[PDB]
Amino acid sequence: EIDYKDIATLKNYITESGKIVPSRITGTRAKYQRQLARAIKRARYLSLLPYTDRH
Amino acid sequence: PVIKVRENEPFDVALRRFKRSCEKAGVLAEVRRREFYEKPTTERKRAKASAVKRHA
Amino acid sequence: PRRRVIGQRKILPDPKFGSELLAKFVNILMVDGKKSTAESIVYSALETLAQRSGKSELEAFEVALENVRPTVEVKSRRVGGSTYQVPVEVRPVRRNALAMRWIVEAARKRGDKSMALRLANELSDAAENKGTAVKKREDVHRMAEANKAFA
Amino acid sequence: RKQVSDGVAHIHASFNNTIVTITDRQGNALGWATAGGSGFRGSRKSTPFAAQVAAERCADAVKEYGIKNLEVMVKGPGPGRESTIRALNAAGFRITNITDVTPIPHNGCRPPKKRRV
RNA sequence: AAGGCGGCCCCCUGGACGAAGACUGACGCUCAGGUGCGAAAGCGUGGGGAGCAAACAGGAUUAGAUACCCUGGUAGUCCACGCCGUAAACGAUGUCGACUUGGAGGUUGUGCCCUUGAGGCGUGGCUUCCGGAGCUAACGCGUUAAGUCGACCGCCUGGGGA
């Protein structure tokens, strides 16, 4: 279900500064945190999410 | 770790928010860390040492 | 001392003036438990003072003293080899003690004839602020501002 | 000889030194002060106090250009981030922004050996 | 399998595990000699060379400082194709199988349940920490045994010399 196009949802699981957030904090199951981080890492390629907050 | 001062705010609240925005990012943790090369054998050892300790 | 936090002793006020702060000055000036002859020297060199700086005998002291009173000093302190002179803001009571003590080490150093001369001229020059007791207070206020970094 | 109005404080906070550099909004530097410039060698070079004077010694050097407001960018770890971003306020500028622009590699270049001390 | 493996995408590809059923019918376990795989350093031929950095140079420190610390810096580190065959290559614990009280977790499957909730009841696999009987010189190990047994292999027989 979790999906690199869905940049609404992916914003809950990054910072102000566009760092991926750890499962520790968010409470998320670790299967899905793998899928999340992979989603986010594609999103950043396509320029839908940012790497940083310099721009 | 970017911040502005919005209008009718003190200086001293913005300088506080700067610091609680930077300890939340861990800029300085992430810079202490790369001062010196740590061999991977040492990285794994310190990791273990923390995990075994934090059983308390 | 480690445990032993303590009070302190009531000195008698000075018999001529009723001045508790001036009794401490004869004690500081006294040698070999001769308080007698300390008082002779002090009471003298306030007459010679107060005459020659427009009167008030308590307050010709307390103008000359107010001038030499410090406000910060150093407090040397090792970190791991090199040794850090830290400025530290001095207590109310210790202000006077250091002032009084410096006046007298200045007075004991000069080359006039009596002690009651020597003292009178390093309470003259304090109040018109030159001479060695304020050259001491200036070269302490250097050290505090030169090492203002460290506090 | 000019006006600018809006500038940019670049503070560069190494462990040994700070450099404050005031620049206009497109990179072109107006003035700068260092801790080493302000009469401080060695131990005292580093301290958060001699970061201060650095600031001043620089806010002094841009009376000419008659700046009102600036943004503060802060680049580095050391002492005199927090001190220097306060001594530009109290020496009479408005502060719009405060930024942290400290280079983090995304694992990149092998640093030097651990020291054995 | 071990050595090991860390941005995202594609192409070629190995194994593991689970569910329900079907199929072969002991086809199994272990293995001297043999063959393969095997970190880092190092060697060969040819590329590359940012950063780091053995050697080497200068500066400090020091009784001295051929070092620790500082400024530089060459092989090397990187790629291709060959060799080398070693490590505290360690869980200092050979492989395979069977049996023997518990508790807390993690990870990955799967089946039943006003799925009514991120849940209730079970059932596989891998893994972390406690600890019982027993074992052990003791430390400890403790269903992933160093407990109770069986099969095959490797190895030890005072310290130096080595």
Swiss-Prot record, chain A:
The keyword Ribosomal protein applies. GO terms for biological process: cytoplasmic translation; translation. Disulfide bonds: none annotated. Keywords: Acetylation, Ribonucleoprotein, Ribosomal protein, RNA-binding, rRNA-binding. One of its GO terms (cellular component) is cytosol. One of its GO terms (molecular function) is structural constituent of ribosome. Part of the 30S ribosomal subunit. Forms a tight heterodimer with protein bS6. This is Small ribosomal subunit protein bS18. It comes from Escherichia coli (strain K12). The gene is rpsR.
Swiss-Prot record, chain B:
Residues 45-56 have a biased composition (Basic residues). One of its GO terms (cellular component) is cytosol. It comes from the Bacteria. GO terms for biological process: cytoplasmic translation; ribosomal small subunit assembly. The keyword Ribonucleoprotein applies. GO terms for molecular function: rRNA binding; structural constituent of ribosome. Keywords: Ribonucleoprotein, Ribosomal protein, RNA-binding, rRNA-binding. Belongs to the bacterial ribosomal protein bS21 family. Probbly involved in recognition of ribosome rescue factor SmrB in stalled/collided disomes; fusion of protein fragments to its N-terminus decreases ribosome rescue in the presence of SmrB. Part of the 30S ribosomal subunit. In stalled ribosomes contacts ribosome rescue factor SmrB. This is Small ribosomal subunit protein bS21. The gene is rpsU. The chain holds residues 2 to 57 of 71 of the full protein.
UniProtKB/Swiss-Prot annotation, chain C:
GO terms for molecular function: mRNA binding; rRNA binding; structural constituent of ribosome; tRNA binding. GO terms for cellular component: cytoplasm; cytosol; cytosolic small ribosomal subunit; membrane; ribosome. Transmembrane segments: none annotated. Changing residue 35 to A/E: Defective in ribosome assembly. The keyword Transport does not apply. GO terms for biological process: cytoplasmic translation; negative regulation of translation; ribosomal small subunit assembly; translation. It comes from the Bacteria. The strain K12 sequence is shown. Has been predicted to contact the N-terminal domain of IF-3 based on footprint studies; exactly how IF-3 interacts with the 30S subunit is controversial. Belongs to the universal ribosomal protein uS7 family. One of the primary rRNA binding proteins, it binds directly to 16S rRNA where it nucleates assembly of the head domain of the 30S subunit. Is located at the subunit interface close to the decoding center, where it has been shown to contact mRNA. Has been shown to contact tRNA in both the P and E sites; it probably blocks exit of the E site tRNA. This is Small ribosomal subunit protein uS7. It comes from Escherichia coli (strain K12). The chain holds residues 2 to 152 of 179 of the full protein.
UniProtKB/Swiss-Prot annotation, chain D:
Keywords: Methylation, Ribonucleoprotein, Ribosomal protein, RNA-binding, rRNA-binding. PROSITE patterns: RIBOSOMAL_S11. It comes from the Bacteria. InterPro entries: Ribosomal_uS11, Ribosomal_uS11_bac-type, Ribosomal_uS11_CS, Ribosomal_uS11_sf. SUPFAM superfamilies: Translational machinery components. One of its GO terms (biological process) is cytoplasmic translation. GO terms for molecular function: small ribosomal subunit rRNA binding; structural constituent of ribosome. Pfam families: Ribosomal_S11. Gene3D superfamilies: Ribosomal protein S11. GO terms for cellular component: cytoplasm; cytosol; cytosolic small ribosomal subunit. PANTHER family: 40S RIBOSOMAL PROTEIN S14/30S RIBOSOMAL PROTEIN S11. Part of the 30S ribosomal subunit. Interacts with proteins uS7 and bS18. Cross-links to IF-3. In stalled ribosomes contacts ribosome rescue factor SmrB. Has been predicted to contact the N-terminal domain of IF-3 based on footprint studies; exactly how IF-3 interacts with the 30S subunit is controversial. HAMAP family: Ribosomal_uS11. Belongs to the universal ribosomal protein uS11 family. Located on the platform of the 30S subunit, it bridges several disparate RNA helices of the 16S rRNA. Forms part of the Shine-Dalgarno cleft in the 70S ribosome. This is Small ribosomal subunit protein uS11. It comes from Escherichia coli (strain K12). The lineage of its organism: Bacteria, Pseudomonadati, Pseudomonadota, Gammaproteobacteria, Enterobacterales.
